[PDB]
Each structure stands twice: as structure tokens, then as C-alpha cells.
């Protein structure tokens, strides 16, 4: 007489009565609908373990995004949401937490789910929480207590998946990058010779670095050769990243430090320890210079860097025995929105601007600091290189010449020295 039909939002059942608070299957649509207590079909909402989409159709074998929970959900073959379980969907593995929330950007035991919720396979993962590298294998599990060949190089993963670095594993040494050593490594006052396949061949004891010879002191690089003379100076650079230094006199005497380069901060921001560092060095009469890490992008930025530098110098009553350093590197913001110009000409302009501003303000003991590879590429210009007298190269020898600068200079040869009176690694240079 009038059965099994939709009357707007209402549904008339097999008999001839209105549906109410019940599931009905429509044969035309081949779909389930849940009819609410109001008599109307539910839509854009959950009912128990099931989701009713726009138009009322129960979701089955499909993803649903719920704006209320800001979460993806997956609805199984019977409509029930996936929860506390793994599902293979479109040839990828997904994990669903309690209440059906898709896991994303997190671990689930030995597996890691990316931002789209997919289990990672054959990929590197840095995890800040564990502050280390992991490698998720073909099966999705993190590599552990085993070797892995990745991108043509060999890596060792320890218990809990940690990538070994700067450490031994049997006859093999994992370098700073984590990759197996295949040639030579100088460390612990020794030279180590590895076969091309990685196993240690030979160990030779060396006496290198700062060596004390009968009342005198010299610096020897890793190729057992002298840098500078007996008057070579040990210069550290310090920043908030070294934490707070409570006993500066201890630091200076016990490590035989001749001077310090102190971080001012970076473009627009003052180093947290600058005030304390300047105060202490001033009071103790330790020779120091300073450096600003630049995030410049143009001449406006370069002028702002100099202005900031000048303000800080007068503010803290800085007494500068060593230069003011423009720390020039391949910078990038943490959110990666901006990164340094690549072209030589833009940096000629930036560096020239900074120098010119400093000069007109009365500061002429101003120089550029950078690392070797950059001075060889995007910085290789007579107008820049004329300002360079402090070069980083964490190598066995500097092996870099600068025709455009003559006189006293520094080589930052390490970022991993330990020193009495300081916690953690310290940057150290030889001045010569
Ligand atoms: C329930 N539908 C929305 C599918 C049609 C009936 O109004
Ligand atoms: C009617 N249920 C929704 C409970 C079963 C789905 O097929
Ligand atoms: C992710 N897998 C389903 C492959 C294993 C988890 O138990
Ligand atoms: C799937 N949720 C758990 C979010 C809704 C239950 O009705
Ligand atoms: C729908 N997700 C993005 C959650 C995974 C499937 O692509
Ligand atoms: C790889 N870790 C074991 C450190 C993370 C939890 O699975
Ligand atoms: C193995 N990676 C090169 C990705 C990490 C270096 O620390």
C-alpha cells in the first residue's frame, strides 16, 4: 500500500510504519542508513561504531575525515571503524589508535607512521624525542643490532635502533655521519687505517694537536705537521649553546686558552649568555672578539646586522682584542621558509654593506668567518676573501690559500673538543 520508501528525511518500513532509532537497508542504493529518534536519517555523524556520510549512506571499506576530531578514520567491510589495530589499505599499512584515530607522525612499537598515516619503509628517520637517527627497513621495522647498507654505504644500528656514529663496532668504525670508515681516521692520539671494505688494518700512535715540548708549545695538525710557530694561540668560540660558564678563570688556565670569540647572537636575536660572558671576560681581562651569525638576504639585512652589532658592543662595554666577525654560512630558517642566496654577487653586496656600515661607525677590525667549501664556491670573490681571516675546516689540514688576505689568521679545526670547566663539545681554533 505504501512501503519501503523515503518520504524526505523520513523512511517508511516494510510494513507501513515510520522507521525510528534503527538501521534500514535500502535495496535501491544498496546501503545502510541509521534512522534517528526524530524519524530522520542520520548524516555527517557517528552512530556507535559506524559513520553516516552526507545523504545518510553508511561508510564501508573507506576513509572518512571527521572535522570535529580533526582526524581520519577507516571504516571496515561491515562499517565498523578500525581501532587498536593495523590495516592494509591501498597497499599501505595503517595503524588506528583507541577510538579509531589514525596514527600519524609517531611510532607504533617498532614501526613509524608518516604524516599521511602510512608505515615508513626503507627510509631514514630522525626523532628529536630520542634525539637520534633510525632506519625503517623493508618490513617497516627499525633496524636494530645489525648492519644495513643504505645508499651504497654501511651503517650499524644498535639496540633500540640507534644509528652508531663516532664509535666502534667490532673491527669497523662508524664515522660522524654514521657511515663505516673505509680509509683512514685520526682520533684518540692515533691514526687508523681501514681496508676499503671497512675492517681495521693498522693502528699507529701519534702525538698531534697542542703539544708541549720542553717549556714550549706548538699546534700540529693531523698530518703531523706544525701550524704556525711556538707563539701559536688557542682560541675558542663560545655561545649560549655551551650553556652558562661559571668558572672562566678555570677554563682559561686549565686549557691554556689565549682568547675567546663570543657569540653576540644571530640576525635580530641576542645570545642568551652574551651578558654574562662579556661581564666575566671583562672582569678577568681575557682577550676576546665577537661574532654575529647572519640571516641576511640583502643590503637592508646587512645594515641591520651591523646596527645590531654596534648596539651590543656599546651596551655591554665590550673591549675587543680580537675582531668582530661576520659569521657567513649557508643559512636556512628552521621552518625552511627562507634560505641563503646562492649567487656570489648577492653576498659580495651583503658582506660589503655590513663592512661599510661598521667602518663608518668607527669599527675597522671587522672580518668574515666561514667554512672552507663555501669560501671555495659561492664566496670565492676578491672583495669577500679580502675580509676572511678565520676559516673552519674540521679536517686533517686546512689546505686552503687566500691570496686576498695577508697576516694573522685563525683555523677552526674542530667542533668536538672537550675542555675543563665546560660541559659538552667546544669549538677550538689555532691563531697563527
Ligand atoms: C536518503 N537519501 C538522501 C539517500 C534519499 C532520501 O531522501
Ligand atoms: C546494521 N549494521 C550497521 C550494524 C551492520 C552493517 O552491515
Ligand atoms: C605492520 N604489520 C601488520 C606488518 C605488523 C604489525 O604487527
Ligand atoms: C569513532 N569514534 C570513536 C570517534 C566515534 C564513536 O562513535
Ligand atoms: C586518507 N589518508 C590520507 C589518511 C590515507 C590514504 O591516502
Ligand atoms: C626506536 N625506538 C625503540 C627508540 C623507538 C620506539 O619504537
Ligand atoms: C645517515 N644520515 C646521513 C642520513 C645521517 C647523518 O647523521
Question: Regarding beta strands 209-213 and 366-371, do their DSSP bridges make them parallel or antiparallel, or are they unpaired?
Answer: unpaired
Is residue 169 a contact partner of residue 180, using CB atoms and an 8 Å limit?
A: no
Q: Which of 79, 80, 81 to mutate to test the pocket of ligand 2 (most atoms within 8 A of CB)?
A: 79
The structure was resolved to a resolution in Å of: 2.2
Crossing angle for the helix pair 299-315 and 344-360, to the nearest 10 degrees: 40
Q: How far apart are CA 82 and CA 8, in angstroms?
A: 32
Cβ-based neighbours of 310, under 8 Å, separated by 6 or more: 358, 361, 363
Spatial distance between the Cα atoms of 206 and 271, rounded to a whole number of angstroms: 38
**In sequence order, which residues have a C-beta less than 8 Å from that of residue 58 and are 6 or more positions away?**
31, 32, 33, 34, 50, 51, 52, 75, 79
Matching residue, cell 621552518 = 335
C-beta 100 within 6 A of ligand 4: yes
CA of 226 to the centre of ligand 7 (A): 33
> What span, in angstroms and rounded, lies between the C-alpha atoms of 293 and 326?
7
Experimentally, how was this structure solved? X-ray
**Neighbour count for residue 25 (Cβ, 10 Å):** 11
> Where do the domains of the chain lie, and which CATH numbers do they carry?
1-230 (no CATH), 231-432 (3.20.20.80)
Q: Measured between alpha carbons, how far apart are the two ends of the chain, in Å?
A: 105
126 within ligand 6 shell (Cβ under 6 A): no
* H or E, element range at 390: strand 388-392
Largest alpha-carbon pair distance within the chain?
115
Which of 113, 160, 162 to probe ligand 6 with, by most ligand atoms within 8 A of CB? 160
Burial of 104 (C-beta count, 10 Å sphere; 0-12/13-18/19+): middle
* Cα 115 to averaged position of ligand 6 atoms, centre (Å): 18
d(CA 31, CA 51): 12
Owner of C-alpha cell 665577537 = 290
* DSSP conformational letter for 334: T
Residue 96 in contact with ligand 4 by CB distance below 6 A: no
CB 242 within 8 A of CB 422: yes
Which strand ranges, in their side-by-side order, compose the sheet holding 190-194? 184-187, 190-194, 200-205
Q: Extract the runs of DSSP E, i.e. beta strands, from 195-346.
A: 200-205, 209-213, 216-220, 226-227, 233-238, 259-266, 269-270, 288-293, 324-327
Task: Please choose, from the candidates 30, 26, 52, the residue with its C-alpha nearest in 3D space to the C-alpha of residue 41.
Answer: 52
Contact 357, 302 (CB under 8 A): yes
Query: What's the CA gap between 307 and 357, in Å, rounded?
Result: 8
Distance 86 CA to ligand 3 centre (A): 6
What is the distance between the alpha carbons of residues 330 and 43, in angstroms, rounded to a whole number?
53
What whole-number distance in Å separates Cα of residue 120 and Cα of residue 137?
8
Cα(34) to centroid of ligand 1, in Å? Answer: 11
Tell me, in angstroms, the distance from the centre of ligand 7 to residue 177's CA: 5
Residue nearest to atom 7 of ligand 1 (CA): 8
CA of 97 to the centre of ligand 6 (A): 18
Q: Coil, strand or helix: which one is 289?
A: strand
| Residue of 36, 46, 48, 84 to test ligand 4 pocket, by largest number of atoms within 8 Å of CB | 46
Give the residues across from 106 on adjacent strands: 113
Amino acid at each position: 500500500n505504501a512501503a519501503a520508501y523515503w518520504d524526505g528525511d523520513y523512511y517508511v518500513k516494510d510494513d507501513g510504519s515510520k522507521a525510528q532509532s534503527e538501521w534500514i537497508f535500502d535495496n535501491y542504493y544498496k546501503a545502510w542508513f541509521y534512522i534517528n529518534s526524530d524519524g530522520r536519517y542520520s548524516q555527517n555523524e557517528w552512530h556507535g561504531n559506524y559513520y553516516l556520510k552526507s545523504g545518510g549512506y553508511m561508510a564501508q571499506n573507506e576513509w572518512i575525515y571527521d572535522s570535529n576530531y580533526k582526524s581520519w578514520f577507516y571504516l571496515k567491510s561491515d562499517g565498523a571503524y578500525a581501532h587498536q589495530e593495523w590495516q592494509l589499505i591501498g597497499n599501505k599499512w595503517y595503524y588506528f589508535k583507541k577510538w579509531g584515530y589514525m596514527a600519524k607522525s609517531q611510532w607504533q612499537g617498532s614501526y613509524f607512521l608518516n604524516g599521511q598515516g602510512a608505515m615508513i619503509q626503507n627510509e631514514w628517520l630522525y626523532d628529536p624525542a630520542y634525539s637520534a637517527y633510525f632506519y625503517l627497513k623493508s618490513d617497516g621495522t627499525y633496524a636494530n643490532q645489525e648492519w644495513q647498507k643504505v645508499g651504497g654505504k654501511w651503517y650499524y644500528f644498535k639496540k633500540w635502533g640507534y644509528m652508531a656514529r663516532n664509535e666502534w663496532q667490532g673491527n669497523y668504525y662508524l664515522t660522524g655521519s654514521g657511515a663505516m670508515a673505509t680509509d683512514e681516521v685520526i682520533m684518540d692520539g692515533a691514526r687508523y687505517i681501514f681496508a676499503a671494505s671497512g675492517e681495521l688494518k693498522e693502528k699507529k700512535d701519534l702525538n698531534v694537536g697542542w703539544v708541549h715540548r720542553d717549556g714550549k708549545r706548538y699546534f700540529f695538525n693531523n698530518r703531523e705537521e706544525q701550524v704556525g710557530t711556538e707563539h701559536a694561540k688557542k682560541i675558542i668560540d663560545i655561545s649560549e649553546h655551551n650553556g652558562r660558564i661559571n668558572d672562566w678563570k678555570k677554563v682559561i688556565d686549565e686549557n691554556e686558552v689565549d682568547g675567546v670569540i663570543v657569540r653576540l647572537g644571530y640576525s635580530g636575536k641576542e645570545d642568551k649568555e652574551l651578558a654574562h660572558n662579556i661581564k666575566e671576560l671583562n672582569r678577568l681581562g681575557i682577550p676576546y672578539g665577537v661574532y654575529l651569525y647572519t640571516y641576511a638576504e640583502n643590503e637592508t639585512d646587512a645594515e641591520n646586522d651591523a646596527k645590531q652589532t654596534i648596539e651590543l658592543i656599546k651596551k655591554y662595554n665590550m673591549n675587543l682584542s680580537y675582531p668582530i666577525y661576520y659569521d657567513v654560512e649557508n643559512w636556512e630558517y628552521v621552518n625552511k621558509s627562507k634560505r641563503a642566496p646562492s649567487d656570489t654577487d648577492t653576498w659580495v653586496k651583503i658582506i660589503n654593506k655590513y663592512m661599510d656600515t661598521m667602518k663608518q661607525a668607527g669599527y675597522q677590525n671587522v672580518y668574515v668567518y666561514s667554512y672552507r667549501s663555501l669560501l671555495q664556491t659561492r664566496l670565492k670573490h676578491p672583495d669577500i676573501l679580502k675580509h676572511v681571516n678565520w676559516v673552519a675546516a674540521y679536517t686533517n689540514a686546512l689546505e686552503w690559500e687566500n691570496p686576498y688576505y695577508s697576516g694573522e689568521k685563525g683555523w677552526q679545526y674542530t667542533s668536538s673538543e672537550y675542555m675543563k670547566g665546560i660541559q659538552g663539545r667546544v669549538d677550538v681554533s689555532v691563531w697563527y
